[PDB]
């Protein structure tokens, strides 16, 4: 249509522009006239006619002459043929392709410049009423204005383009340049394009048009054209207004972090349909039981196959296969309508918190097994197996409308708490919870390496693999192999001028602080500075979009292909006018645009909706509360810790929660820039939660964390338990009364003093742990002063006090063989007290020591509900589970036969009862459970009678009948014994006895006559059944004082006599009970044999029970008369009345036969002694002591007892009397005259029994406990003599006083004698093995290594038993079971080592060659565990490796002083004669025992041996002067072995003499006792 004006050139200008003949026709004829006026108003018609001036002169001269014309006879095409090409003498560009674009550019400049006249005329019509944006941008250019929209100013800038083209083509007159008219065509299409996309919206589409008219300047300047100099200012104002200042790097950071997204309009409408189904699947997943996890795991896989099929652009079977998943959920919903027992979501926090330790791209299979039995939605799971996911995936789980549960032990403190409180639940949750705690064991085993790794040095790693990727794309080259100055030089060459400021102010401090991070504060500050860093490099001020740049370069290609095809078809009609039918030269001259030049137009499709509304929303939020002035106030507040810290942050995490939820459901079409921004707001919220977990570690009133028990490495350290008591001192003292939780912690420290086998380091936490138990009783008395129980009623503070003294008895035992299996179940109870009551504790990471104990607690519970007592008290899960199934099968048959019937009463009544039976919790006794199975049998029996024969429930009545019979047999077993519970209820009075003895014994230790009178009331005012429990507790205070040692030895003497004196009456009290029980055991055994069934008749069984319960209450009531009878009657009655063995200590020639050469080998022995004359005279004098024999007194007293038996028993007492009265006065006159002959302040000592029981010496040594077998026989009848006691009685009572005073003062030197006797016996055996010593004395170098062996003696065989248990729990859930053989073989070879280190009492030098073999075995044991810590689990072997690595001249004078004091001590003994029953032998034989014990002076001789052995075991000697010391100790050994044999003769003679006179005292006193009564 400009060629139609070019072909219509008739000379001159189609008759000289006739006068508007096209107007005489009258749109195509009127618009063509405007192009001709535009052709003549410029000089374009006048510049062409100056080109034909050589052509007109050449045609005039060559051809015939004629009249001259103004314009030549040539068309305006000017480029065909026919010497018009030879008019290219000047301006040689007609052969060039710029010839056709001269006439064609004025067509397009006209059509665009006149289009701006129409819009500018429209601006003066209206104002702000259904106008366009380009029309409203002319409001600042014209009069009529508006209210807004002056930011882009397109009309004032898309008008200076066309006036330069109006100013250049008007005054050029050149038609010759380097492709000028080629370059005036591509600009004049962009101006058409900048007018179409500026009508309504899209400020973001004007980012391409500041580059298309900027690459055009760089193209016209590369052609060396002089036209670029002429204007040079067509976009230097357009970039002044539209430029951006905040984030320049959005166009470069978008490309590498982008994931795949669908590309068609048909896909996002179907992608929303899949998430619409993915929400309905979540509501069905939380309603299925444990058997339907084979079908949910299939339906959570098909969503992955459809997430790969939406992206595949393959929609053929999509709508078909998506209906199959609707058919799959509807089948899964149909089962969900039939569940009568709704699923209680239990362990909801256990499976939710095992995801956070696993949720990443790696280990994507462990998450899928944790997926369906949890609370994680399926729309978040499909971003794990497929790697469509962005930024590290922990951030998508933490915040819900949980960062403390990933860096603490809060997972493990809650598994223990939900396991102890499991048994207090209803009866519907026992078949669902044994399959819920079983799946939790199969999860913590398979996630064991994920729990144990470091969690504060792991997120440091995932920052440096994500901070060194941002520097990788900005700075060219790798950020690892580059210096600190080499990276700063490449910022100015690769990046802009504004990003250089923030890249050296926020990111480079976020790399320095990420390397020097040692706490959670230096890593939480290095994460937030990175968080504010990439918000100044991604978010723009004005709307910039890196995806519009590809969708305009295709729309511009679509328009310049349209104008090229418009130019071809409008020119094709001109071919039939002044041309032939083959070719025109301008057909070659025009450029044809190619079809195969598509500039890759789909990346991510964005439709005509404007994105300029989104970037208004981001800068309305990021400048509101996420600015750099809003975030630096919180960092400057946490560092100062002034005030109001944790309440600004919750306002911050709530603003960004609704913000990222606005963008998720917002705009529905593109998530490229939403996902990358979401990884920068989730990151900066994680940077503050790293400062919550630092200030909570800074507040610490108690440095003892929970889970202080349930770890075998913190209990076994003897120093650590002592340091865990001085820190809880603000918890025991600052407590309130009636709390009943402080007194359950002090129970646990008494089971650690037992567990360490009563060490001397833990004695402070055993004495001071009992004093606060008494102080919580001394206050509760200050405020107080200011069918078993059902038939007993017809006619918690005492369960703690009862257990504050059962542990106090069980500590003081012989041996325990301590283990870790039963000492951690008592630790699982204290942590539920310590984590609920005690606050402000320490936060720590999970360790391998505490995971080995919680797996033991879950498998201890789930093996108690499966594997298989006292009737009407027990709970019996394995019995309630059999009843829970046999009733549920009846409940199923009711609902089958209810829907046609419903209105009956029997089918309604038992349906209510059967629902009530399954609702009973498992803490109920079997009495209430037998009642509800009795009522449901009677309703089932009467419905079988009235109904027809089509019922067929014979199979259910027979099973209920045999179960009720099976529960009556367990009732008969409680009637059989029935006294073990009665003996325990009288044992429960221990808890108030312990505090009564602690006030009189220990506080007096903290006098002698005050204790016995306070203890005589403890045994006298007592019962008969609770008498053995008193003797079993005073012994627990007798071993409490021997545990203290020799600090108060008197208070252990006041308590040993009173135990043995009241142990004397125990066979009388035990006889009174065991014969009275024979009358009551037969009566109960008769009534049990009556209650037996034949032809069962279950209704008759209940009536036979109540008759049996009435008779059994009286027998228990009669049995309480034997127990609660008084015990004062037996004590005041005395004993009835036939004489004992001894230890018989005799060992002489064991060490008498290296002594012959020892005399010759011995340097000062000649300074101040033979051995042949000494050791022979020492043995010659030993015979004279052993030949001396004392007569017995029990033979004299037994002579009178046989004479008084004949004189008394032969009397027939019929009123022979005068002959008998003389004979009666003979033996009364002979006995009191015989005892006057043989020997014989006394009354100030012997007032009563409680006076001589105080100031008396004990016989605690275990050689002569038989010597007190008769002196406590003469203490029962000592008050009975004073009650009855006419001149012989006053003489006989005064005669037994002087013999008692000569029997009390023997006990004190004789008990001191056996105190030194057992010391010299234990030191004789030290110097005996010291003669057979073959090496050297290494006791300064080997004594420290024995303690290292003995510390491995008591613990290391016990940890091997504990590590052999947790490998059996893993063996039930894994295949790693062959690792048990490398611990039992490691245990059996240790038994060959600890016997060798215990077989020697004094140590040799050969053990240094044997201790190095033990040290080599540990380094070989430590390698066998490391090679076995593979293809399995590591937390079992981790604590045994961690514990092992955490635990890996003058002597001749001392043997001369004990040799001069052993002869002078023995010389004074023979200074008194031996002299073998003549006269006065009771005042001499009780004197001779006091002389021979005194003259041995065993307190001095056994003292010099104590100083002599101290110079041989403390210090050490080399291989020199060691054969000389061994020649001295073997020189004075055959003297000590004779002095020890001089003590086995004096002791064995004065022990038999003491058991004979005390037996003679007992026979004589019963004669005087019967004389005063008869």
Residue numbers in the entry: 2356 to 2381, 2390 to 2764, 2772 to 3156, 3174 to 3182, 3202 to 3274, 3280 to 3417, 3427 to 3557, 3559 to 3560, ...
Q: What does the article say, verbatim?
A:
Rea1 consists of an N-terminal α-helical domain (NTD), a ring of six AAA+ domains, and the C-terminal tail. The Rea1 tail is subdivided into an α-helical linker region, a D/E-rich region, and a MIDAS (Metal-Ion-Dependent Adhesion Site) domain which is responsible for the interaction with the Ytm1 and Rsa4 substrates. Rea1 pulls out the Ytm1 complex to promote the transfer of pre-60S particles from the nucleolus to the nucleoplasm.
The Rea1 linker map revealed side-chains throughout. In addition to the stem and middle domain, the Rea1 linker also comprises three α-helical bundles at its top (top1-top3). The linker emerges at an angle of roughly 120° from the AAA+ ring. The horseshoe-like arrangement of the three linker top domains is stabilised by the middle domain. The connection between the top1 and the top2 domains is established via an extended ~40 aa peptide region between them, which could provide flexibility during linker remodelling. The top3 domain is a four α-helix bundle insertion into the linker top2 domain, and it connects this domain back to the globular extension of the linker middle domain. The D/E-rich region and the MIDAS domain that follows are not resolved.
